[PDB]
Ligand binder design. Structure first.
Ligand SMILES: Cc1nc(C)c(-c2cc(CN)[nH]n2)s1
Ligand SMILES: Cc1nc(C)c(-c2cc(CN)[nH]n2)s1
Ligand SMILES: Cc1nc(C)c(-c2cc(CN)[nH]n2)s1
Ligand code: NA
Ligand code: NA
Ligand code: NA
Ligand code: NA
Ligand code: NA
Lengths: 215, 213, 212
């Protein structure tokens, strides 16, 4: 059977307008709605991401986690000429799909896709990919890695004063260590944008509990 | 209008006044159409029905009313003399629930309390003449299942044999509540699996701007 | 990062590759950390049913994280197929990875979609005559409709075993009334208590007797 990401890409290729990032994003949205698949990042979170990018005009963005490439298209389409997105993806098939999604969108020249784990690639950014400091980091990979990778980014000298970290899913499934750390630290000035997450077609459950009397 | 007011209007325009089954079927029909709407679970409703028929509670506490589907579904199975108390924090939802019960003809069995569970629970004995509760349906804010259960205990509102039924203990999940009642010798627990077509929860994005050391 | 995706990461970092037993034990270990041993309660019944009937073609409705697929596939005789329907695409992907790590991928075909869409395609698209066993473990609202649909499509024969999971209260009274009331099914109920006084899991076995 075809992967979830392959099917999304195929719908884009058959329905979106080539070279039109907005058309690509709408076709992903339309397909996920039709299939009743929950979106990793939809338009609600996407509008928050757009607003941050437009406010800070980052020239170099690091993205942790690519999925089918929706978020990469969402951010890359707003980058100025000369600006650059680096996307880390641990799954080689998602990395290939993201590359092909960006190609269809006409955004291939703005994005470099790195296949591997964040903690293996981050220490290579300076020498292997000629990075000085990052202007913005979008964290959307394994939730238990947000704080370690933030500390790793700091230890590697990849953060400058004014680097924007934008972290998805900090409430659900949640990154409570990351939040407590950056909010408590004087090294980070923190703003939280409330939104929503959707679940579709998941196992749930009920509990019956019969009180036995005080014990 | 609000999404719950539209469900109420659909009931009032299509269901038979005085017929709880008709009201329940109309809500089900309307929610299935509307893609924004939480669908009603068949097996979940049957679990609720079976729990009420098995224990025949004379006094039920419901935490979280929403639009009144569950209040109609439970109150329709209460024996004469039994009552349901429903706590709902949203005033428009409390009003719609009252109108749903009025249309179903069930309003004499139910008392709707508009407010927060941890404010209202301590008032039950003195203000609403409660001795102990026979059954509690937990369906409100998931992070409140555990503290409100502990509060129901502390207030002396549970007796031996009181049945707690908690929904959504896996998604979004109430792991601390489950750890408590399963690990406590004060509760005998049974788990029922279920399936959710759709659920929307609060999430957020954090913007953290590095300042330097 | 999802609740099921972390089970897969825990298996990958703890179980022995190609060994279905250690994969099951890794999942059982993981799920018991955070509490009831449903894997054992449910899996003990599944094992006994599979070993009694030695099915050559099993249809599994619902996969979740792949535990049940690894559980049944590890017991299948050489040349036996498991077809697994899972509507959630993330759970389908996890189950495939779970089966890959256990070394059972060649016994199983994962179909990602809804049972009412997929069941009518089994004969044409997946070269199915009739099924030897069906494991109902998906949406309880679909237990009865899919049982009727499997009949209508001609996918059951005399002796086909249906086994329905988590029938306790029951939340599926219409399904039970149908198979128990019908002379076309001989029925057995299993209640697993493990060492406790409450039912950890309950299952209905319904054996098709033929059209009537
Ligand atoms: C340690 C990790 N590094 C990366 C890039 C990860 C990741 C997570 C996802 C989403 N499935 N894509 N990439 S996890
Ligand atoms: C602290 C709270 N008390 C109550 C009654 C709450 C509630 C939750 C819902 C469902 N949205 N209705 N009422 S939250
Ligand atoms: C109509 C449906 N078809 C299928 C395969 C469903 C399902 C439910 C679950 C829960 N694990 N998995 N697949 S619902
Ligand atoms: Na995300
Ligand atoms: Na701070
Ligand atoms: Na709906
Ligand atoms: Na207990
Ligand atoms: Na029968």
């Amino acid at each position: 059977g075809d992967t979830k990401e392959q099917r999304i890409l195929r719908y884009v290729q058959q329905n979106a307008k080539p070279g039109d990032p907005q058309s690509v994003l709408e076709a992903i949205d339309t397909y996920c709605t039709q299939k009743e698949w929950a979106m990793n990042v939809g338009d609600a979170k996407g509008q928050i991401m757009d607003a941050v990018i437009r406010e800070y005009s980052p020239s170099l963005v690091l993205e942790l986690g690519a999925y089918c490439g929706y978020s990469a298209v969402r951010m890359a389409r707003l980058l100025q000429p000369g600006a650059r997105l680096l996307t880390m993806e641990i799954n080689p098939d998602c990395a290939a799909i993201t590359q092909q999604m960006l190609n269809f969108a006409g955004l291939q020249d703005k994005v470099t896709i790195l296949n591997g784990a964040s903690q293996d690639l981050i220490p290579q950014l300076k020498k292997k990919y000629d990075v000085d400091t990052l202007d913005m980091v979008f964290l959307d990979h394994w939730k238990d890695r947000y704080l370690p990778d933030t500390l790793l980014l700091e230890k590697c000298g990849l953060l400058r004063k004014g680097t924007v970290l934008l972290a998805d899913n900090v409430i659900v499934p949640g990154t409570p260590d990351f939040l407590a750390y950056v909010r408590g630290s004087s090294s980070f000035e923190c703003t939280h944008y409330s939104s929503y997450l959707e679940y579709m077609k998941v196992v749930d459950g009920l509990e019956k509990a019969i009180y036995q009397g005080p014990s």
